[PDB]
Design brief:
The structure is a homohexamer. Chain A has seven helices and seven strands, in the order βαβααβααβαβββα. Chain A has 187 residues and is of the alpha/beta class. The first copy, chain A, has one domain: Flavin prenyltransferase-like (Rossmann fold, 3-Layer(aba) Sandwich), CATH 3.40.50.1950. Chains A and D meet through α6 of A and α6 of D. Chain A: It catalyses: (S)-2,3-dihydrodipicolinate + NADP(+) = dipicolinate + NADPH + H(+).
Amino acid sequence: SLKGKRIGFGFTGSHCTYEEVMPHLEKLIAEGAEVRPVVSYTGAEWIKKIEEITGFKAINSIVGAEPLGPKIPLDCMVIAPLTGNSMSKFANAMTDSPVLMAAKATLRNGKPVVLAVSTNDALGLNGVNLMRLMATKNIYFVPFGQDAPEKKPNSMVARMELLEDTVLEALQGKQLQPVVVEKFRYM
Amino acid sequence: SLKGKRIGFGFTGSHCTYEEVMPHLEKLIAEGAEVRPVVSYTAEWIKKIEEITGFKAINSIVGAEPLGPKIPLDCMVIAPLTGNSMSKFANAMTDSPVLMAAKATLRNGKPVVLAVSTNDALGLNGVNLMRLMATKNIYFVPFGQDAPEKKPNSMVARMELLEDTVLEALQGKQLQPVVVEKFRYMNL
Amino acid sequence: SLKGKRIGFGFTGSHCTYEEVMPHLEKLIAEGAEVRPVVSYTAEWIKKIEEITGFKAINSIVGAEPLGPKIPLDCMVIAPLTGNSMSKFANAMTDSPVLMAAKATLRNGKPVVLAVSTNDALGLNGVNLMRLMATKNIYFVPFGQDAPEKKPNSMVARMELLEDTVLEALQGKQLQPVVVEKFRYM
Amino acid sequence: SLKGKRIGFGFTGSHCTYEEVMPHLEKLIAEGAEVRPVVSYAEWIKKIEEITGFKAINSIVGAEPLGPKIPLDCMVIAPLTGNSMSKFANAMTDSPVLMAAKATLRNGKPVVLAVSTNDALGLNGVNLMRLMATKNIYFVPFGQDAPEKKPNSMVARMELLEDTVLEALQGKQLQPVVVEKFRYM
Amino acid sequence: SLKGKRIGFGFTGSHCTYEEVMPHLEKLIAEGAEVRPVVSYWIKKIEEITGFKAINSIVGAEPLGPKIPLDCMVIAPLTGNSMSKFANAMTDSPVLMAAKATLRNGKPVVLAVSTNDALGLNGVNLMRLMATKNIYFVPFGQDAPEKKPNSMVARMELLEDTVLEALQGKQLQPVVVEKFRYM
Amino acid sequence: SLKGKRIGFGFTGSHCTYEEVMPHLEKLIAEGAEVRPVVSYTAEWIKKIEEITGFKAINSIVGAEPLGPKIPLDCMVIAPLTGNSMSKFANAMTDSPVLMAAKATLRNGKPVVLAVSTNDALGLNGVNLMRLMATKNIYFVPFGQDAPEKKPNSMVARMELLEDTVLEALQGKQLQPVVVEKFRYMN
């Protein structure tokens, strides 16, 4: 039950690729949570609609994301999808995006951040960043695995369909298991 | 003994959080130092800073490069130093005027003095902080937790010790004690 | 709320540096905890700890492994934590009984409490200290500079906050403030 | 192929845990490889020395020649404890197995690891991923062996060791490298 | 044999600094390689030499993965900032993205290092890369041991040789040289 | 001027590895310095070391601790420095008399001088070498590739330059050039 919970939802990467996450905002709000959308960019139909579904303007600036620390604290922050670029910057404590600042404002309070990974270098250079996050207080992952062991050997991507189950567990300070899965047979 | 030194003064983050350093520029100059302002953003308080110091603020990465070969600083100060810029500094990125200024200073084996201020200092930013603490020619204004219940992972320098810190750094020494109870110095 | 908890207690470094923790052992038992000592080395200091506590000290890596599946700790304490052991713990090495016990505890997602003592805390050991601070289920007894002039990079825990530290740890919390002016409690 | 290849085989951790990598060791030799055992330190050692025709390298000094004088074609380490995996990623050499692997990387030759640690998704995650990304290092496919009882634990599928070696000899990582280990217990 | 290979060529840093690699782009084409310019931002001339548009956006760089795979991605010069970003797996420029899209496929990236903090804070980054799969360096060293003690810069004149060896999965040796004697 | 300076000299790795550094104790002593030997293990080429200088070689971690508060060094030399010891030193481990002596030296803010020698300097040990290069009070005897084709990842110090290195390190300076074509000085 995330009824009564304030849940942040950040988007990173490419405008169009956010099709799959829509039903998830739908489910969250349907299940009783208040959702605050955060976007890493200041027309956009995708976002045009996101503000419709839930009853809040998209936080789209770093300064707009700051109040999530002291003024409007989240019970959980979600980032999906989480690009390789943003994962790297998050693991390093950078905050040059509204979505990262929202993450940081959330960890500020010792509250959970839920990540849905999606990067073609997860088993290359981004591997260390991934595992640093996995090991960090208050950070949880949507179960993930390789999505294309032949076509993209270093690629790992989350099972989005498990996002809600992951949030529910993170709200209890727990990582949903199994967190490492053969993603490639749920394509 | 800041007297005659060429001192860079960079600042990162929100603008309004800067009146804590406005009087510091004034201190440094009253002390005889030559102060070169560096702004990580390309706002009139800037022309005020520029009148105080007698130099146009450096406000581009290219305007900062000459701080290396042409006009070398005796010390580079960054204050406040945000978590974002601290992480970038620790990783040797230079995508801002202030970071490039700091780099052009370490290029010459010269001191860089940092005043930390981030709410993730004892979270993900901790390793960045300590990497810098351990690094040649980098010094910290003494710092600590400013709000252990409200912001448990937060650490912030005692700005008032800024001048004392750069005085020690010009001699290549870290001002001690460097780790302090910052929350005991919130109302000066 | 130490009552009915199984508490691991590990010692690292020279043996001569333990009189300052013995009393803390007895406070834990008085509070109703079952304490399992483990020593990083196979006098009375050993016989005593075993007398006080109700158990033979675990003194081998094989001896510590069952802290995982058979006798799981509710919390594992390491005081003092030498700089050597801190660095190895942070790097996930287990070449001592204490390190292995600590691993066996994190295995179960249970809290490990550390009381740092090293003269390079602000030097090369700093990153290791801060990696741990950031890590799931690891807690520090509040610590700070013990001798800022004579030992500039040195930091040491306030041993007297040990029990309070484990109490918060048992709830998944870091005792605050965790960074203190250790040199005033000398 | 494996035929003719000189394959070092390093064991780390408790001697008991070794009776599950014997058949794979036996498989390598049935395939034409010479298997040169090296041990971090008995009855079990003799069986391994008897199966392969070679006395195990058991000292740091006996492992050094593996660089300049008698280089292998591939070095396998199985099982790889969390302790040894950490030291390996950090370039320590205080055991025959670790020295042997360093002497193999010395020459740009492949090192194949079969991981086995209850902290792979804890503190040791960084180390595993450092190795994953490093030149000439390969992993036998691995994953969680017990998601609820040992949430941070990961362990290789030993049955894929020969296929991992085969790919490593071609400078390739056998794919997929991330598997649901717990579905093959 | 650059013969028939598709070689990506990314540039980072200041605009004017490029006079050094421009004849190299020429050597590559004369060796029979198809060269795709990538810019983190003279340009025209390169597009004239190369016959290809400069990829100048991150989205323009993504196709280098699935559709137009490179056989080699070259970055020269490689600034300290870009090297750090690259080592940390960031992709906030066309060039970094091109590099990622190349390592995506297990293909070589060749780096020509140029930074005054190489023996400073960037040192760890440089060594992370040196040890990483599919990354090769044109040999480099201190260009000015007294004037810029922490500085290291590649020997550009060795770029082609580096690219040749990388195609074979090899690092050109010696990779550590006294740059200052060829300055 | 090594005259009047107390300088620690630690040895790591194989035993026979010291047909090289014998003249160095000699040169240092001749230069008017007090040399304190420390040995990573507690054929008496070592009896001569304790002979050349008038001190028993520190051979235990405990014998090394006093190098901190009681008999501080002006400089600690480690030559040669194996890849194992280099990694341990970079990671702040102290499980040898030589590592403990170096830690007791950095304790006081004093220079440590390192003569690298490892076949994985350009492999996994690269990151450790560079962490050290960048750290306060750590200096290197100039080093480079000793055999680019034979051992592509190997780097080794120019031992001939050891004294000039300590002399600079005493003044808080790193001797330049620090990166050299070592393969040219093999004769």
